[PDB]
Every structure is written in structure tokens, then in C-alpha cells.
Design a protein around this nucleic acid. Structure first.
Lengths: 95, 126, 56, 233, 90, 388, 118, 99, 65
RNA sequence: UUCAUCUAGACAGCCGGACGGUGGCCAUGGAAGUCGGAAUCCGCUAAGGAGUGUGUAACAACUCACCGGCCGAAUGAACUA
């Protein structure tokens, strides 16, 4: 306690012996486990997984797009029957 | 020996006034300084920097009208090391620093004077 | 401990209702329906440089 | 379309050059051949860019063309038929590895004496024995690691202990922010053919105690159109 | 240090607490950072004794004139705080 | 002093699509820019009625043009999100384009000369539909900073004399900005019900000419230009010894408002009477009268002190788009959806001459400074130069 | 619902003078409870800074934290001493003003909530 | 009702667990002010308090659900209540990150 | 809301005041500061509801300008 | 199926280079490519971002982007079914 004590602890002793290898291996196995979760996770969890993956794909597409792209009427007439926006609506029964 | 204590706007006390008396009247700017350190003696003097030399030639802002000859004198001041063949190229090298500072060389942006140089409208005495 | 398993038997009411669902959707799609670029001479064909010669 | 490795894409400014760069180098060497009188081959296998820039600034009149071996081979001519001038593949065949092909109009002996008198300090560059021997002290290791009085230096940064422990295979512990070992690790002996990790250890400790002197093999004169071989280092 | 650090000890069968505070600069005081305002509020609020360390020496990267200047700057906080000065060796 | 305009031009040709914007120079009755429905613009030598310095670089419709009050630079905003600066002598682009906006440009303004420090050039304040107002250092051609307070389109922007920018947007609010406070919004003016069109100021003629009266004589040095423009500004801003510039607004609620934006945040008067919307407003160069052009086939005259009604100019038969003044504050020219221009004597409150000769909707019109020509252009792709 | 030019038009209009007089009379009337309006259905009764723009929750506190100095700053350094002493006195005062050990009070009987019910 | 109760339980754990920056001690008050910007602190916690709105939505939509005459109507009302809750929480993205 | 003028289903429903989809209502607009030529403030305008509020507690509508 | 790279050597691996003005300008207790805001230029180059990430209180060091050496013939991306 008292301040960023674990940051001090990591500076003084340091994280573990088996920390960097394991992190590398987790990052490597994540490619397998992503597909493993796709072919598994029946139901709502699989649906949400697919939603997340689609959103993540769109985000990276837009990021790459932004990278590669960052590499007659007048002003006043621009921005421009007496029928209401809803004639012929569904008919309601008295019942 | 040598150290660099730029740090401006053993015996670590007397080095303070030894540095300040290298910047007595000029500079009042964050210049770079070289300290040749003998036993406990601090022979401290400014090493020329392009940004500081430009800002001498002129939150804070910058608009210079450096007049195209003070930059040439700066290019002569630090064509020493310079890794460059000709003064006509060191001048472009310094005009880039001026562009980053945000100055206004003669009355144009210095990239346009680089255009005039490499196009053949501005001369350099070699 | 393995759990249940859904059944594949079709229980006739369902296949009647599906036939009716599709017979209705076909009419709806036919009603909404009321509202080329030749791909070329594809590569990997070895004798493609000869089709360019019967033109004139 | 699947069970492949995904390429790790990253979004930087620079982009690959392609065949246009090589054609440009080709045209440059071929138009400089007609211009300058003497042309030399320099073997520069492991260099620093400031050393190369010093060599270039030594003469702004003469040219130095680096690039790909096989491109310069084609510009000169590897076959006796395919060649720009006469007896030129005789020179082009000498190119071994990283070749910096120089053009000049200057006397032979100035170049010959310059490129044997020119010598600098450099790292020991593995697959090359080093004329030094280092036992690290058996206490706390410092940024220079047994080269100067420790009262000048500071202990190295704790962030390097995973590197030293795993990649360099040093037995390493740390007591507080300082790195520590129990016994004096010997890294190398003089006349010992160096390996990658020994070289990286000496680089990390900042030891440029190897003599970089550029080697020159051959030399070709346009007016005579003759080759001449002189291994000079 | 960018924060307050606390320690305890027992003196005369009584718990005391010592507080190390990160730092103060001479800073004409209508502009200062949130790290020095910690020190200022701690010195102002608490009912302590207060030990100013001077370090009479060329060390410190700070001159004795600046040290006494800071002391004279922050002595209005010291009006009821039981001050002591310690020299840590013309 | 200024005489009415009677005779036309030939039907001059050039950039062959719809004309959209028009502007005379501030120092000559002979140089005029037009931006068209192609991605180009063109300068014209009015004395000869000849096309000159055709001007490319955009890739969509040129919408807005403006001439620097010193007369050295031209600026063009287009339907693409870019602004391009031009030298009129070369007829060439001055560096690359000044991009940074996300949607098309609506209005432009230049820093008035009497605030520019000597030996420096006037900045460029640009608006845009994306809801932002950018400030460009025109000599380094880079954004100084933006103002991103608004939500909807910014229809108008105006740089005043007291270092203040006034912007009018479709969010029914007029925002004031003290550029000396690093582009901080200080006051927001909320009285309109519909969306704002063509904010205007009292001293904008002076701020536009910048030490260039009806004589055409150029100042010697920028040190003289500062004083010669500052006196022109102060002789009309010191109408009563203390300086005030009036601001007027127009909106699609069939109404204008009149503000003294520093003396008070509330409006003095709400000028009503138009049946359809107001599209263009104009103070007189002397800052005495105000005039409003509406889509109800009408133009209306007001006094620029208390917002009182004077009279109504009539004669048009379709949508009025905009108007312009003479420098003598006696003659008013108006454009319309009909093919006619029309001149109005303001003293007798009467039409002086109806100017047909176009063949379609006339979108832009402008009067020279000295009163020697009026340029007009629209859908018929043929710019006309009507003179006495 | 058929088209009509009578839609899209102002259906209910009022002049400013009548409006303000109507406001005044009813502000007079409807403060007095003994008074009462007669029809009440034909009558129009309907006629009667923020710092987050500057600081973004993230420049204030967090890994980014572009906030080194305060704006809640007193000058004349003795002034914050005068403040701190006043605040400590106020605090000690509130303490004795409003002035646990492992026992509780019994449940409120359910009969006291009988008037209260859906 | 369960969806309402969950949100208000969560928000109450935030409001009661966090300290009142006034009403503590002047020293701690000033310290936490120079650390966390008292204004931002109070503003975030007031945002959460006013969001604890969810009760209003739950009560209103339950009282509306009493008159549901069909499964589709009742389902759409349920969806509407939960969606308005979601909108309220979506408008709480930055204060929670701060807190 | 000020009134209901036209529910397209059986104008009895107008007198009852039923807000079904397509219903046309008078709403107050004094908050917008609309004013006619002459200076008379407008405080009532027609609007058409766009939703079925039996399914949603909201009554969402579009102004008829 | 389409588009690209390739014996003037492609893809993957190791090795080396990865520079100079420059610790570019604002800012700050400190920030040097990498807490942030805005420029984002030139030089020398085979190539080397006023810098892709790890990291340091700040430097350092490592890394990729890009180039070259060894290796010696196919390879990559986007799509459709």
C-alpha cells in the first residue's frame, strides 16, 4: 500500500523468471484459441463472440483506410404537394 | 573529459555561474552547452545549435523575418560537421529547422525559399 | 453426465406449416419484386493470345 | 483460405521501393562509368552509417555507389559478351558481398594509401575473434561492465535482467533495483572465434575494440580498359 | 517521490507518525503543481513538528541561498508548527 | 457621384458550367474573379471583356471566392473540403491546398488590415458545413486553430474590427469568438427559431477594401496601409465618438435581428415583415441603412441604428438571392430567380432601371468600388458586365 | 388523411400585448385561492459554466492527465492558512453538533405503515 | 423490475462506497481535490445519482404493462424499458472510466 | 400537447383523443420563439405522430411546418 | 476468379545497417522519435518515420517500417462457390 507499491516491487525484484516467455506463448496461442471459441461456445456466447469479432474487423478496416487516405448550386440553395408524412396508416378495429 | 548539461532557459555549484557567464547577455534561450571537465574545473561553453541560433536571429510564438543572410551566417557557423557538401544544401537543412520553429523567413514560408533555391531563383555564394 | 439431445423427427404439423410459410413468402417476394459485363478472357488459359486475332 | 499464419500488419510511413530503385542505380552506375576515369571495388561487410558518411564526405567530387551485388554485376557485365566496356566482367566477378563501388578521377596512389591508412574502432562482429578478454566482477554489474572504475559508472537498468538472463544466458539475480551476480562471468578469450551472444554482450557493454579497415580488391581504368588487383586493407 | 509517504515509530510508549513529502520549489505561488500543493496542504493542516533539512554542502544540486529562500517563503505556514532545522557533512 | 448602370456587356463566355460566385477586386474596377459549376475559376479583364488566368486545382464545384483586402491574394473554397490560394498575376496556386475540413466550404473572411501587424499578411477565417471554423496562417498556409462549438452547418462567418469573429450556423445561434483569447467562445446569441443565413456587419465594406477608396491609388508601404485602413474603419465605427459595430442576422423564420454584440448580449430589435425567408442582408458602406432580400419577391429597407422600417422595394417576380450596394450609399442592385437584375434609388425609394439580358436564374452579382461596373452571373454560364 | 393547405399553417396565434396583459391578470388571479376561473377549458393556460468542455475527465486524472497545476488556487499564501484554520474549526464544530457497539434496535411494527399502501 | 434493481444496486454500491469529498476532513478534502479535481469528482457522482431515472422508467413501463393485451405489445414494452436503461448507461461511459 | 384534431380512424376517436399512429395533434411551440409577419407569436402548430404508442411509452411526432 | 512480387534472387528465417541538422517547436518538476498539442522539412543515402511498439524519472537499450548479406524457386493479399 501507500503508493504504487507493485511498480516499486517490479523495479526492485522484477515480475518473475517465467513471465516474458509465457506472455509470448499466450499471444501465440491466442490465434488458435480464437478459432477454438468460434467453433465452440454454443448459443448466446457464440453470437456475442461473432458480434465482437465483426466489430473488431470493421475497426481495423477503418484504421487502415484512415492511414492510407491520410497518406451545381451555391452555398445558400444547397442544403435545400401538401401531403402529410403518413397517409394511409394501418386500420384499427373497434375490437 | 566531456559532459553535456544543456539544462538552460564535480563541484556542481561554481559550474552554475560558469555556465551563466557563458550566457551573460546572450543567450536567454535553451541553448546546448559542452562542459570540458578537468580535475574539478568546469570549462563550459556553448555548442552551436540550429534552433537556438535561429531563435537568437529572430505561450510564446515566433515570426522572424530573418532576411536570408542571418541564416547564411548560421550555415557558416555550423557547416563545421554538417555532413553536407555545399552551403546551398546546409541552408535548406536550416530552413527546415526554421519551418519547424514556425518563423517567417524573409517574408515567405521557408519551404518556398527552398523551392526557389532548388529551382534556380536564389543564389548562394559557396 | 451428458445432457439431452434434440430430435430430428419432423412431426407433420411442422412440415405443413413450413410449406405454407414458403408459399406465402414466395407471393410476398413476387409482390416486392415489382419495385451485362462479360468477365473476359480469363488467365491460366495457355492459348489466350489467339482469341485476339479473329477480330479483323 | 484458412489455417495460415496471419501477417502482422503495422501502419508506418515508409514503403517498399521495387524495381524502379534498381533501374535507377543501374542507370547511375552506367552514366558514371562514362564520366569518371577510375573505378574501384570496396568490400564493406559490416559498417556504420557515420563511418560511410565520413568516407563519402572525404571527397564530394568522387562517387560511391552501394546497392545490390547482382544489379551492379549486370550494370558492369558478368559475361564477356554482356558488358558495357572491355575487360569489365574481369572486375565485376571480384564482388563478393556488400560492395561499395567507387568512381573517381584521382590518382591511384592517393586512394591506395588512404584506404590502408584509414582505420577506425568498431564492434567485434561475430564469426570474428576479438583481441580482448573480460571477466565481469562478481558483485554488481555496471553499464560498462568492467572497463572503468565503478565509481564513475552507474548500475545498469533493471529492465535488462530478462535480456541478460535469457538471451545472453548469464546467471543473473537482482537485489533491489541493482542487478547482481555471485561469481565473475568470463565472456571471451583472445583468439576465440566469437559467437552472436558474445558479440551482443560486448555491444551492450559498449566495447568498440576491433579494427575496422576497409578492404579493396581491384581497380579498373577506362582509358586503358584494364583490370588490376590489389588486396589492400 | 511524487507523493506523501508515511512511517511509524514508538517513542516513550507512544505511537508517532513521520511523513515524507516529495518537494517544494521557490515558485511565487500563484502557479504551482499538484505535487507541491500536497506538501503545502500537509504542512498547513497537521498538528505536527516539522523538520527542515538543509544539507549544508555543495551537494543537492541546490544552493544554500535558495534553501534559506524557500524556508523564508514557507515560514508563514510555520507560525504554530514547532519547527526544527537540521544540517545534514565563509 | 456614382451613376446608375444602363448598358450591358457582350454575353461573355468561359468556364462552361453554372456560375456560382463572383467578386471584383478591392483596388481595380477591371479585375474580377468568378467561380463556376466546374472545378475551375477565371479572372476577367473587364476593360477588354476578355477571359484571363483560368484557374484549376479543385476537383468539385467552386462555391466561395474572396479577394484579400490588400489585393495580393485570392482564396477559393469548393464543394470538396479544400481551400486554395492564388496569385492573380501568375494566375497560379500558391503552394498546396489548405485541407482539414470534412465537408464543403460555405463562407470566407480575411483578417482586416488595420489589425495585421506591419510586414505581415492577413489571416484567413474559413467556415464549413461540418460545424467548424478554421483560422489559416495564409503565408505558411497551415491551420492555426479551429473553433468547434457549433453542431450543424456554419452558414456565415465575419471578422470584425475589434479582433472578434461572428459566426452564424444552422443551430439557430450566433457565436462570438475572441481570437485574442486563443479562439475561445465568449458569447452565444440565441433568439432565432429557424436556421441562420448571411450574418452581416456594419463596417464590412471598410474591412473588405482595406485602404482602397474609389480612387484606386495604392498605399506606398504596409506601415502606411495600416493607418490608411484604420482611419477608414474609424471614421465609420466612430459614428458617435465611441466605437460600436452593429451586427445583423437573417433566418428562415422570416425575420432578422439587430445586435450590439459587446454592449449587450440581447438583441435590440427583431425586424419582421417578410412573408418568406431572408437569404441575404447588407449594411450600407456608411453603416446607416440595412437592406434585406427575401424569397417573397421583395427587398426591404431598414435603418441600421434601431431596426426601424423604411420602405419596400418591389418589382421582382421570383426568389431574390442577394443584393449589393454602391459605395455612395444611393444605389442598390439586386439579383433574382428571374433573369433580371434591378437597380433601386434608395432616396426616392424607387426602381431606377430593370436590367434584363440574362436567360436563366442569376445567382451572383457584385458592384465595383468606384461604381463603374457591376458583374453578374448565374445558370446561363455567361457572365455579364453591366456599365453606364 | 388527405392533403390540405390548412395543415402546415399556424393554428393558434396571439399578439404580444394581449399576451402580456393576459399573463399579468392571471398571475394576479391564480395566486389568490379564493378566486376561481369559470370556464378553464376554453382558456389558454399553457401561456404561463460547465467545465467538461475544457477538461475531458481524462486530462484531469488518468495515465494521460494533462493537468499539473490547479485553478482552485489562492494567492497570498497566508490566505490558505486562514482558510485551513477556519475549515478545521468548522469541522470540529459539526462534529460536536451531530454528536454502534454491537446491539440493534427492534423492528418497526408493521401496523405503523397501514395508511401507506398501493 | 429485476433489470431496474440490478442497476440501482450497482449504482448504490458506487455512491455509498465512494467518500463524500466534503464532509470528511479539510486535509483529506484538499488532498483529494488536488489529486482528482473535486469538480469532476462531484459531477460524475451526480451523474450516477441522477441516472439512479432508471427507477422512473421501470415504474412507468410496469404500470403501462398492466394494460398489455398481447404478447407482442408486452414484449415491445419490455424491450423499450431495457433499451432506455441501456441509453442511460451508454451516456455514462466517461465518468465510470474516471471513477 | 394542446389537442387532437384528426385520428384517421372513425372521428369518434378524435373526440375521445386517441393517439394512434398517423394521428394529428396541436402542440405548443412557444419554446421555439416562432413569430409571424406582423410580430404575433405563434404558440400552436400541427404535428403527426409517427409511432404506435401502445407499444412504446413514447409519443413521437413530426411537425407540419 | 482477380490483382501483385520474383535468378537485376521473391516468401520464411538468421546476421548487419537502421544515420545526420536534432535533445526540431510548444508546453513541464522532468519528456531527448514513443504522457500530451500542433508542424511533419530538408540533407546524405542501398535504405533509414521529426518515428511502429516494449522500456527509462529522463537518457540508454531493444524493436518495426525500410535497405543489404547468406539461403535458391515459387509466393502474398482480396474475393466467390
Amino acid at each position: 500500500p501507500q503508493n504504487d507499491y507493485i511498480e516499486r516491487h517490479i523495479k526492485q525484484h522484477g515480475k518473475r523468471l517465467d513471465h516474458e516467455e509465457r506472455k509470448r506463448k499466450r499471444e501465440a496461442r491466442e490465434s488458435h484459441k480464437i478459432s477454438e471459441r468460434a467453433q465452440k461456445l454454443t448459443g448466446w456466447k457464440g453470437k456475442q463472440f461473432a458480434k465482437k469479432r465483426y466489430a473488431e474487423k470493421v475497426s481495423m478496416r477503418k484504421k487502415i483506410k484512415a492511414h492510407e487516405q491520410s497518406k451545381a448550386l451555391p452555398t445558400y440553395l444547397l442544403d435545400r404537394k401538401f401531403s402529410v408524412p403518413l397517409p394511409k396508416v394501418r386500420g384499427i378495429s373497434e375490437e | 573529459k566531456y559532459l553535456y548539461l544543456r539544462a538552460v532557459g564535480l563541484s556542481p555549484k561554481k559550474v552554475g555561474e560558469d555556465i551563466a557567464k557563458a550566457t551573460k547577455e546572450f543567450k536567454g534561450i535553451k541553448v546546448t552547452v559542452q562542459l570540458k571537465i578537468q580535475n574539478r574545473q568546469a570549462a563550459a561553453s556553448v555548442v552551436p545549435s540550429a534552433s537556438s541560433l535561429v531563435i537568437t536571429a529572430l505561450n510564446v510564438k515566433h515570426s522572424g523575418n530573418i532576411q536570408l543572410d542571418e541564416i547564411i551566417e548560421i550555415a557558416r557557423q555550423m557547416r563545421d560537421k554538417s555532413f553536407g557538401r555545399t552551403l546551398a544544401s546546409v541552408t535548406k537543412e536550416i530552413l527546415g529547422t526554421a519551418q519547424s520553429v514556425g518563423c517567417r523567413v524573409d517574408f515567405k514560408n521557408p519551404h518556398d525559399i527552398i523551392e526557389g533555391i532548388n529551382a534556380g531563383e536564389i543564389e548562394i555564394p559557396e | 453426465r451428458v445432457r439431452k439431445r434434440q430430435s430430428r423427427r419432423t412431426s407433420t404439423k411442422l412440415k405443413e406449416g413450413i410449406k405454407k410459410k414458403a408459399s406465402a413468402h414466395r407471393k410476398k417476394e413476387k409482390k416486392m419484386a415489382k419495385k451485362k459485363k462479360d468477365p473476359g478472357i480469363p488467365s491460366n488459359f495457355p492459348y489466350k493470345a489467339k482469341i485476339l486475332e479473329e477480330i479483323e | 483460405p484458412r489455417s495460415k499464419r496471419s501477417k502482422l500488419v503495422t501502419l508506418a510511413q515508409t514503403d517498399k521501393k521495387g524495381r524502379e530503385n534498381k533501374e535507377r542505380i543501374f542507370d547511375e552506375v552506367r552514366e558514371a562509368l562514362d564520366t569518371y576515369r577510375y573505378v574501384w571495388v570496396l568490400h564493406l561487410d559490416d559498417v556504420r552509417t557515420p563511418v560511410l558518411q565520413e568516407i563519402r564526405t572525404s571527397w564530394a567530387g568522387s562517387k560511391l555507389i552501394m546497392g545490390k551485388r547482382k544489379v551492379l554485376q549486370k550494370a558492369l557485365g558478368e559475361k564477356r559478351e554482356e558488358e558495357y566496356k572491355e575487360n569489365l566482367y574481369q572486375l565485376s566477378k571480384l564482388c563478393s558481398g556488400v560492395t561499395g563501388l567507387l568512381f573517381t578521377d584521382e590518382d591511384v596512389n592517393t586512394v591506395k594509401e588512404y584506404f590502408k591508412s584509414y582505420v577506425r574502432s568498431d564492434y567485434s562482429r561475430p564469426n570474428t575473434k576479438a583481441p580482448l578478454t573480460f571477466t565481469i566482477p562478481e558483485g554488481i554489474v555496471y553499464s560498462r561492465g568492467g572497463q572503468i572504475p565503478a565509481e564513475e559508472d552507474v548500475p545498469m537498468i533493471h529492465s535488462l535482467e530478462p535480456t541478460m538472463r535469457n538471451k545472453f544466458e548469464i546467471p543473473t539475480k537482482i537485489k533491489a533495483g541493482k542487478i547482481t551476480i555471485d561469481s565473475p562471468y568470463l565472456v571471451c578469450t583472445e583468439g576465440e572465434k566469437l559467437d552472436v551472444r558474445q558479440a551482443l554482450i560486448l555491444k551492450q557493454f559498449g566495447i568498440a575494440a576491433s579494427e575496422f579497415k576497409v578492404k579493396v580488391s581491384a581497380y579498373y581504368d577506362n582509358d586503358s580498359s584494364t583490370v588490376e588487383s590489389t588486396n589492400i586493407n | 517521490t511524487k507523493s506523501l509517504y508515511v512511517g511509524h515509530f514508538d517513542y516513550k510508549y507512544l505511537r508517532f507518525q513521520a511523513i515524507d513529502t516529495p518537494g517544494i520549489l521557490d515558485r511565487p505561488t500563484e502557479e504551482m503543481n499538484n505535487i507541491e500543493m500536497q506538501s503545502i496542504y500537509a504542512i498547513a493542516h497537521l498538528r505536527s513538528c516539522v523538520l527542515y533539512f538543509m544539507d549544508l554542502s555543495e551537494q543537492c544540486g541546490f544552493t544554500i541561498e535558495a534553501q534559506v529562500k524557500l524556508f523564508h517563503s514557507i515560514k508563514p505556514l510555520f507560525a504554530n508548527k514547532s519547527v526544527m532545522v537540521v544540517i545534514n557533512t565563509d | 457621384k456614382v451613376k446608375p448602370v444602363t448598358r450591358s456587356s457582350s454575353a461573355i463566355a468561359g468556364h462552361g458550367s453554372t456560375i456560382l460566385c463572383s467578386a471584383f477586386a478591392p483596388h481595380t474596377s477591371s479585375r474580377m474573379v468568378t467561380g463556376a459549376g466546374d472545378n475551375t475559376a477565371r479572372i476577367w479583364d473587364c476593360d477588354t471583356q476578355t477571359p484571363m488566368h483560368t484557374l484549376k486545382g479543385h476537383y468539385n464545384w467552386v462555391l466561395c471566392v474572396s479577394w484579400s483586402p490588400d489585393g495580393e491574394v485570392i482564396a477559393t473554397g469548393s464543394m470538396d473540403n479544400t481551400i486554395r490560394l492564388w496569385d492573380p498575376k501568375s494566375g497560379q496556386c500558391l503552394g498546396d491546398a489548405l485541407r482539414g475540413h470534412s465537408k464543403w466550404i460555405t463562407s470566407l473572411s480575411w483578417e482586416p488590415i488595420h489589425l495585421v501587424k506591419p510586414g505581415s499578411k492577413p489571416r484567413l477565417a474559413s467556415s464549413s458545413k461540418d460545424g467548424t471554423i478554421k483560422i489559416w496562417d495564409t503565408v505558411s498556409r497551415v491551420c492555426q486553430y479551429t473553433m468547434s462549438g457549433h453542431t450543424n452547418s456554419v452558414s456565415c462567418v465575419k471578422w470584425g474590427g475589434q479582433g472578434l469573429l461572428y459566426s452564424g450556423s444552422h443551430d439557430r445561434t450566433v457565436r462570438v469568438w475572441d481570437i485574442n483569447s486563443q479562439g475561445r467562445c465568449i458569447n452565444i446569441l440565441k433568439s432565432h427559431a429557424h436556421w441562420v443565413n448571411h450574418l452581416s456587419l456594419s463596417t464590412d465594406y471598410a474591412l473588405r477594401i482595406g485602404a482602397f477608396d474609389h480612387t484606386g491609388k495604392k498605399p506606398s508601404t504596409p506601415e502606411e496601409a495600416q493607418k490608411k485602413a484604420l482611419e477608414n474603419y474609424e471614421k465609420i465605427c466612430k459614428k458617435n465618438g465611441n466605437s460600436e459595430e452593429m451586427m445583423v442576422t437573417a433566418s428562415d423564420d422570416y425575420t432578422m435581428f439587430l445586435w450590439n454584440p459587446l454592449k449587450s448580449t440581447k438583441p435590440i430589435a427583431r425586424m419582421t415583415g417578410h412573408q418568406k425567408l431572408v437569404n441575404h442582408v447588407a449594411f450600407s458602406p456608411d453603416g446607416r441603412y440595412i437592406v434585406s432580400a427575401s424569397f417573397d419577391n421583395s427587398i426591404k429597407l431598414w435603418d441600421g441604428r434601431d431596426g426601424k422600417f423604411i420602405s419596400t422595394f418591389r418589382g421582382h417576380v421570383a426568389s431574390v438571392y442577394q443584393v449589393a450596394w454602391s459605395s455612395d450609399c444611393r444605389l442598390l442592385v439586386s439579383c433574382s430567380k428571374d433573369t433580371t437584375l434591378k437597380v433601386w434609388d434608395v432616396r426616392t425609394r424607387k426602381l431606377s432601371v430593370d436590367l434584363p439580358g440574362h436567360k436563366d436564374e442569376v445567382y451572383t452579382v457584385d458592384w465595383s468600388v468606384d461604381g463603374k461596373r457591376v458583374c453578374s452571373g448565374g445558370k446561363d454560364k455567361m457572365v455579364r458586365l453591366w456599365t453606364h | 388523411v388527405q392533403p390540405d393547405r390548412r395543415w402546415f399553417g399556424n393554428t393558434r396565434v396571439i399578439s404580444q400585448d394581449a399576451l402580456q396583459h393576459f399573463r399579468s391578470a392571471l398571475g394576479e388571479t391564480q395566486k389568490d385561492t379564493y378566486q376561481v376561473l369559470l370556464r378553464r377549458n376554453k382558456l389558454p393556460m399553457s401561456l404561463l459554466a460547465r467545465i467538461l468542455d475544457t477538461e475531458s475527465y481524462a486530462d484531469a486524472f488518468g495515465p494521460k492527465a494533462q493537468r499539473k497545476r490547479p485553478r482552485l488556487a489562492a494567492s497570498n499564501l497566508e490566505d490558505l492558512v486562514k482558510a485551513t484554520n477556519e475549515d478545521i474549526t468548522k469541522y470540529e464544530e459539526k462534529q460536536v453538533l451531530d454528536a454502534e457497539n454491537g446491539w440493534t434496535s427492534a423492528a418497526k411494527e408493521a401496523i405503523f405503515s397501514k395508511g401507506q399502501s398501493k | 423490475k429485476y433489470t431496474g434493481e440490478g442497476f440501482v444496486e450497482k449504482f448504490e454500491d458506487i455512491l455509498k462506497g465512494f467518500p463524500n469529498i466534503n464532509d470528511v476532513h479539510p486535509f483529506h478534502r484538499d488532498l483529494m481535490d488536488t489529486l482528482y479535481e473535486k469538480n469532476h469528482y462531484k459531477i460524475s457522482l451526480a451523474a450516477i445519482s441522477r441516472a439512479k431515472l432508471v427507477e422512473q422508467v421501470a415504474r412507468d413501463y410496469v404500470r403501462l404493462l398492466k394494460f398489455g393485451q398481447s404478447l407482442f405489445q408486452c414484449k415491445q414494452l419490455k424491450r423499450a424499458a431495457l433499451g432506455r436503461m441501456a441509453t442511460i448507461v451508454k451516456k455514462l461511459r466517461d465518468p465510470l472510466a474516471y471513477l | 400537447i394542446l389537442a387532437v384534431k384528426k385520428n384517421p380512424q372513425s372521428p369518434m376517436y378524435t373526440q375521445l383523443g386517441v393517439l394512434t399512429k398517423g394521428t394529428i395533434i396541436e402542440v405548443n411551440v412557444s419554446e421555439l420563439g416562432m413569430v409571424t409577419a406582423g410580430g404575433k407569436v405563434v404558440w400552436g402548430k400541427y404535428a403527426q405522430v409517427t409511432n404506435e404508442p401502445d407499444r412504446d411509452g413514447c409519443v413521437n411526432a413530426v411537425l407540419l411546418v
